[PDB]
Amino acid sequence: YLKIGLIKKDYKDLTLGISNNLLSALSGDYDGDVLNIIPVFDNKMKEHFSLLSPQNFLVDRNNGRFNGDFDLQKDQILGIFILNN
Amino acid sequence: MEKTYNLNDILLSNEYEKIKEDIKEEIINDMASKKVKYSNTSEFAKNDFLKDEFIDLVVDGETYEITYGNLITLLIVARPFNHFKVPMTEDLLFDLSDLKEYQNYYTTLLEHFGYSNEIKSIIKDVISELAIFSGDINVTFGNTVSIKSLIDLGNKVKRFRELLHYRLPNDEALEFNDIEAIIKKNLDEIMKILSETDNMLRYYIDSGAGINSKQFGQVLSLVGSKPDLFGKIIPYPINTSFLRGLDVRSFYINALGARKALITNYQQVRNSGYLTRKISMLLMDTKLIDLDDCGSHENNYLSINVENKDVLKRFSKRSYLNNNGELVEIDINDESLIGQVIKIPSPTTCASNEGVCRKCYGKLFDINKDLNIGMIAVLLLTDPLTQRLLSAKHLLETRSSKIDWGTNFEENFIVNRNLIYPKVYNGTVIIKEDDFKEDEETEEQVFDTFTLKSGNRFISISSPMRLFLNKDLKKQLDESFYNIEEMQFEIPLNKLDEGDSFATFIMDNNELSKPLREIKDLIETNKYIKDHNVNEVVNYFIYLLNESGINIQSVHSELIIREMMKLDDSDRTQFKNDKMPDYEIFRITDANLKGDSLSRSLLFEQVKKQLTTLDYDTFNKTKSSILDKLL
Amino acid sequence: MDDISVIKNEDYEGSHRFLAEELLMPNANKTDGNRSTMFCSHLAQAVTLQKAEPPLVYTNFENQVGKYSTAGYRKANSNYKVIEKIYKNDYNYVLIVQDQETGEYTLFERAECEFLTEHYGFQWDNDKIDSLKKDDTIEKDTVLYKNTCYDENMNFGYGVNLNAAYFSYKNETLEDAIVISESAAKKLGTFSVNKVKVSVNTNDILLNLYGDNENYKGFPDIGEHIKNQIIASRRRFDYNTALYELKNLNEMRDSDTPFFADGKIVDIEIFSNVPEEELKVQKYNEQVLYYINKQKEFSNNVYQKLKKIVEGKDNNVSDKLLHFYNNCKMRIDENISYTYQNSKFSGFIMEFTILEEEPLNKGSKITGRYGNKGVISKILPDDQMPTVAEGRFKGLKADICLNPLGVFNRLNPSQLIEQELNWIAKFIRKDMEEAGSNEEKVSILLDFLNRVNKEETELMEEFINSLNKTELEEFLNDIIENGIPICQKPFFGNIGLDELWELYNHYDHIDYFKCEGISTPLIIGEIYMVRLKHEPHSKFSARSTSFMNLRGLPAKSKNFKEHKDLYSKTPVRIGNMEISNLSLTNEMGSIMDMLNSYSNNETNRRELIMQLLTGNPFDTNIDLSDVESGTSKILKSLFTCLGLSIDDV
Numbered sequence A: 001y002l003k004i005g006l007i008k009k010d011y012k013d014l015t016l017g018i019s020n021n022l023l024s025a026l027s028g029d030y031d032g033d034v035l036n037i038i039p040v041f042d043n044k045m046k047e048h049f050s051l052l053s054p055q056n057f058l059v060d061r062n063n064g065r066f067n068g069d070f071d072l073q074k075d076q077i078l079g080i081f082i083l084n085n
Numbered sequence B: 001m002e003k004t005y006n007l008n009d010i011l012l013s014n015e016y017e018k019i020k021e022d023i024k025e026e027i028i029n030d031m032a033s034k035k036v037k038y039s040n041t042s043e044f045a046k047n048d049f050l051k052d053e054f055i056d057l058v059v060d061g062e063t064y065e066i067t068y069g070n071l072i073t074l075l076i077v078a079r080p081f082n083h084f085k086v087p088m089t090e091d092l093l094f095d096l097s098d099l100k101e102y103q104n105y106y107t108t109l110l111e112h113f114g115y116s117n118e119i120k121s122i123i124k125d126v127i128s129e130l131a132i133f134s135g136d137i138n139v140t141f142g143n144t145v146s147i148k149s150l151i152d153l154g155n156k157v158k159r160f161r162e163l164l165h166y167r168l169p170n171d172e173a174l175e176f177n178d179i180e181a182i183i184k185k186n187l188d189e190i191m192k193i194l195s196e197t198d199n200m201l202r203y204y205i206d207s208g209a210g211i212n213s214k215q216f217g218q219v220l221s222l223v224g225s226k227p228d229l230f231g232k233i234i235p236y237p238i239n240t241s242f243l244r245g246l247d248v249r250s251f252y253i254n255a256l257g258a259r260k261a262l263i264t265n266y267q268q269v270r271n272s273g274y275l276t277r278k279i280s281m282l283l284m285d286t287k288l289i290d291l292d293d294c295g296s297h298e299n300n301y302l303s304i305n306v307e308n309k310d311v312l313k314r315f316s317k318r319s320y321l322n323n324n325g326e327l328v329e330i331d332i333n334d335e336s337l338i339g340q341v342i343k344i345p346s347p348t349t350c351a352s353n354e355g356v357c358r359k360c361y362g363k364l365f366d367i368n369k370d371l372n373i374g375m376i377a378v379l380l381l382t383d384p385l386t387q388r389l390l391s392a393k394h395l396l397e398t399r400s401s402k403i404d405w406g407t408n409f410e411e412n413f414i415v416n417r418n419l420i421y422p423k424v425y426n427g428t429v430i431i432k433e434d435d436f437k438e439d440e441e442t443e444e445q446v447f448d449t450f451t452l453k454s455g456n457r458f459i460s461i462s463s464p465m466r467l468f469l470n471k472d473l474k475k476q477l478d479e480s481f482y483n484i485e486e487m488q489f490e491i492p493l494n495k496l497d498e499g500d501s502f503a504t505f506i507m508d509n510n511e512l513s514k515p516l517r518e519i520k521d522l523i524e525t526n527k528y529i530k531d532h533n534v535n536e537v538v539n540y541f542i543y544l545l546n547e548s549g550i551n552i553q554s555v556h557s558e559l560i561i562r563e564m565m566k567l568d569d570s571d572r573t574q575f576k577n578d579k580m581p582d583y584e585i586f587r588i589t590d591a592n593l594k595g596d597s598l599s600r601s602l603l604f605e606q607v608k609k610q611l612t613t614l615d616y617d618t619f620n621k622t623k624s625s626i627l628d629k630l631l
Numbered sequence C: 001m002d003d004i005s006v007i008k009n010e011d012y013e014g015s016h017r018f019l020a021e022e023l024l025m026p027n028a029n030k031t032d033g034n035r036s037t038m039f040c041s042h043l044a045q046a047v048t049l050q051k052a053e054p055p056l057v058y059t060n061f062e063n064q065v066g067k068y069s070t071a072g073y074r075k076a077n078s079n080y081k082v083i084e085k086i087y088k089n090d091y092n093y094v095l096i097v098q099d100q101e102t103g104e105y106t107l108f109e110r111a112e113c114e115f116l117t118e119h120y121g122f123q124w125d126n127d128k129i130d131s132l133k134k135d136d137t138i139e140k141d142t143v144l145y146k147n148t149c150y151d152e153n154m155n156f157g158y159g160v161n162l163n164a165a166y167f168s169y170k171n172e173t174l175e176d177a178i179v180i181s182e183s184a185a186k187k188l189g190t191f192s193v194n195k196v197k198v199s200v201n202t203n204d205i206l207l208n209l210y211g212d213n214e215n216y217k218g219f220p221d222i223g224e225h226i227k228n229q230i231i232a233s234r235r236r237f238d239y240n241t242a243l244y245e246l247k248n249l250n251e252m253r254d255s256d257t258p259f260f261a262d263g264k265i266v267d268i269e270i271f272s273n274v275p276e277e278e279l280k281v282q283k284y285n286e287q288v289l290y291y292i293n294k295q296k297e298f299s300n301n302v303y304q305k306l307k308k309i310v311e312g313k314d315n316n317v318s319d320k321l322l323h324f325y326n327n328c329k330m331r332i333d334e335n336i337s338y339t340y341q342n343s344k345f346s347g348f349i350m351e352f353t354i355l356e357e358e359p360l361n362k363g364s365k366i367t368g369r370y371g372n373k374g375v376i377s378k379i380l381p382d383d384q385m386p387t388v389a390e391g392r393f394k395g396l397k398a399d400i401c402l403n404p405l406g407v408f409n410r411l412n413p414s415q416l417i418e419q420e421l422n423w424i425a426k427f428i429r430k431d432m433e434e435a436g437s438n439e440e441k442v443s444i445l446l447d448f449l450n451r452v453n454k455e456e457t458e459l460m461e462e463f464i465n466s467l468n469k470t471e472l473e474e475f476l477n478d479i480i481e482n483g484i485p486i487c488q489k490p491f492f493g494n495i496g497l498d499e500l501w502e503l504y505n506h507y508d509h510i511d512y513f514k515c516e517g518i519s520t521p522l523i524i525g526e527i528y529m530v531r532l533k534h535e536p537h538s539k540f541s542a543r544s545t546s547f548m549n550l551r552g553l554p555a556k557s558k559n560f561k562e563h564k565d566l567y568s569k570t571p572v573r574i575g576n577m578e579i580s581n582l583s584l585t586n587e588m589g590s591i592m593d594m595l596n597s598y599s600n601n602e603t604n605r606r607e608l609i610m611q612l613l614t615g616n617p618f619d620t621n622i623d624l625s626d627v628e629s630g631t632s633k634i635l636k637s638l639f640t641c642l643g644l645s646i647d648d649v
Ligand SMILES: [Zn+2]
Pocket: B294, B296, B349, B350, B351, B352, B356, B357, B358, B359, B360
């Protein structure tokens, strides 16, 4: 359950700009495969489907701990490692 | 850099954001100004960056010495204390150099603020900000892969060049397991050289990102033996590395492996959806109720064997009965439970028909009560299993097993790869006519026990692996190498020219997908289910999960197994009685078909037999489901 | 098993008979089988490039592939003499020729573009056939028209050469993504051709979308370009609605049917079953009458001019020429009737060929020759990219930037090899430029080549010795600026690790480039890049309300194929697994409301559309009815016919 924050200003550009940390939860990569978008209109439906928001998936349901799928990807890991070590 | 920073004062001050940005700007500008120098040797060059310089941090009145980059990362990770205006606590601190601990911090954060929605928002904010700064570090401090890096490291360290130019000795005979051990030794040495010297690839291998030991070792050193499409180990190994070159035979082996990978992917695309569909359809209706005690009998709580550490890891936020007789939480860190069998309140023994109680699910209830439980369980089981299957078969690997050929065989014969060679080309090999049996997969004749006569002595040999005789000797077997009086084949080794193999054998490696397949079989084949009871199926499930490496908590697996079983009474209250009620465990397909829910059975499989025949007792089904609303 | 024992390495020595597609991949010895399979698929997924260049690092088997593929060039196998040239359009004409040896008569047609399927096609270089006039001579080997993939000397190139670097650009290269400069984006442009048919009947009339008050044009002329992305629009005419709807025929109305396409017209063909007199009366279809008369005049010309050739008993006419003459004679013949899909059509049918140049966009996939797939993440200004500011190579910028994380894990070392060889080639070219003696230049070049591929060195020695001094100077200069060709054959003749070791130890001066603002010294070098067919326009779909099926449930329509719609408007399916995953939220009521309002129930859909159309735009709260869904009705009817009826307990 995601939120639109920007409308792209170019008619030629037709690509959903998704955050990198979202890749692991989707179990997907930038191979060009198409993702499906279903807009949610009703406010009650918004509060009901908010359980699929990234915040609710931050807590890994197996261990009750932080989900590593929403943590840093390997490139971000390289950056942070260079910075701190 | 100001040498001293007060952590709690920066966190409480409203100038926190601009201070973070100023530190970030200073670090990135200093990195852009300077250039990295690689010694490519054991000694490390004098590269002075702003991130490497140390600073003193004042936290709760104590001084901790950390780096400047550690400071800016700590400020990013300390957003909750600026949001809530609460002082930074020294227990909420860790080694910012070790990345693996970061997750732990986050977890503690979730526990420290009571799993508030606001603390979750702050975690997401910290992740976003840290990612942006990671991108900045990556663009300013570049990352690059090139061949000249390895070439220069080999220039400085000759051992690296020797390993990169390594070739397995074709002068002397080598068995498959020795080849595998050679690959492992040389690859470990390569990784050690990469970690112990200042090369351009040091950050990759030390960060664990961008370097896989097996693939990178295939690139640098020998590739090794590769399997066939049918899972049989191909005899001729790939001596040269991909960078060094390849041969036409090696190219054929490589293309065959690639075709195997594509075929595997194609078939798993079809299998995964079916498996996950069955399990999800069964576990969709699992529920939870807020009742502390369901009345389940303490004797009815099933038992589990704490055989190893992983089995103890499966049970977290799980209850167990002490020797006083009182229910008490399980602490995973305690090793006193190992080597013991413990009876635990289990979801499979819950006596509430409305839903699982707080006791049988555990303390995790409050965490997972927002979402559907059975769906969480089925997803947690189905994602790693399918991903592991696909990745394991896509990563073509050889698992050669050591063979004890025997004293007679080893002293009178010589084995090299898949080839059997006579030490001396004299004497005669006698083989009994009946012992030339037929192998099913080979569709050709094989001999397992043969006797060789040399001089006055007659030796008898039995081969651990089936042996295919050489083609030239087999061609003349019936014409001139058979004695009808004795009903035995006598083959003179004198006829065989030197360097010609006496026989050949095939070897099948132990694929990495066997425990995962056993998981799937236990769920579907019903072989283990019919003979065994719940206490042993849960242990088999946990043991197979450890064998496969899948990390899923045993509570979800217990739910998966619970939904498969059907009570003969079909009433949960019977679990409140003294002894376990009558039940029968079924396979995943039969569970919902033989179940009591109309919607999950009609919308699943075998609509024809359900509507036409009463074999599934479909007309008697009256139980409700959420899936009923879709009808 | 031991079957592979039949493969003898000695038998396939100095041989490339086992390689097929891989022949176009340099250093195929070093790449893994998976990446090679990806390359074989990419060769099919490749698109024609307007600025195609021969590969800098090549296998020399590429020109053979170009020659034996017959779809890009046309060769007049025999010696011909141009009998005549007749013009259908300024962009399309026809050449009638005669074999000087055999005496048979044959035909050659020209056009600006060729269409393969869907929106895929390419432009032509018709300069050789356009230079031909009447009574000219065509030789036994002559390229009458060629694709852009082939250059002037028939060298074949399937992609461009781009300066690349392995770099992490603000985490925009995560997984596998490419950031490319605008200047490099210009070189990675392709053609898009579409054959769109608009059918007009007596009921519908065209709209004056193009032109002024004096001139009525419903569709662009041959040379004109498309405006507002609409080829035409048609209104159904009925006498009851004619008084108000027909007025203001210049502007669009909600009742009109529009047809969408973008580019430049290059050929229009109109087939009319209407009597020509009625078209003469109608002002709105005057342009159709003009083009109809143009086609009829072209056919009259071909008849008048080729009757003697076709009907001469002591003459031989090719079957193509005979069929062309017969078709034109049928078109000029009286009582001619055209049928589409085995049915006589009312009115007329217009077929437009539209050609445009589509450039590189975000989401477009470009790959190399070693299975290195990549999706363009950002197209950035060429200044806002790694620039080197140290040494002789100052001012050089990276055309593309690739992910460096898992280059080793992908088991494709040939990428790095090509980059390294073009990188050292840069230094060789600079050393050549600094020298003032031509002999010194050829000495440096032959040294480097002998270090790489010896056979190319011998061939270049022969080629240089054969050249005139002015031709040698041109050769040297263009090599200095454009680049040096290096030959790395796929399996035999490639440069291994030890050869690169020798090259790196000899040229001691060569070192990593230090770039502005980047701490890590990196390497930039030219590698080959090809463009794949998959693109953001390929699978884009956006449906709000579209045609409903006979069962009252949403379903796809052929409108996008007929160019009646701009985007697909194709409905997504919510799978059973998707329902299971959505069931994580225990609000089954909201999921059922979603499915009912979007698909199952008509009343809920109408209510949703009305709430969104009128009410508060920023706060949308809907109340839905509990009327049974149409899917439930279909289920009820089917089970009733079965003899069973589901009833709640
Ligand atoms: Zn219970």
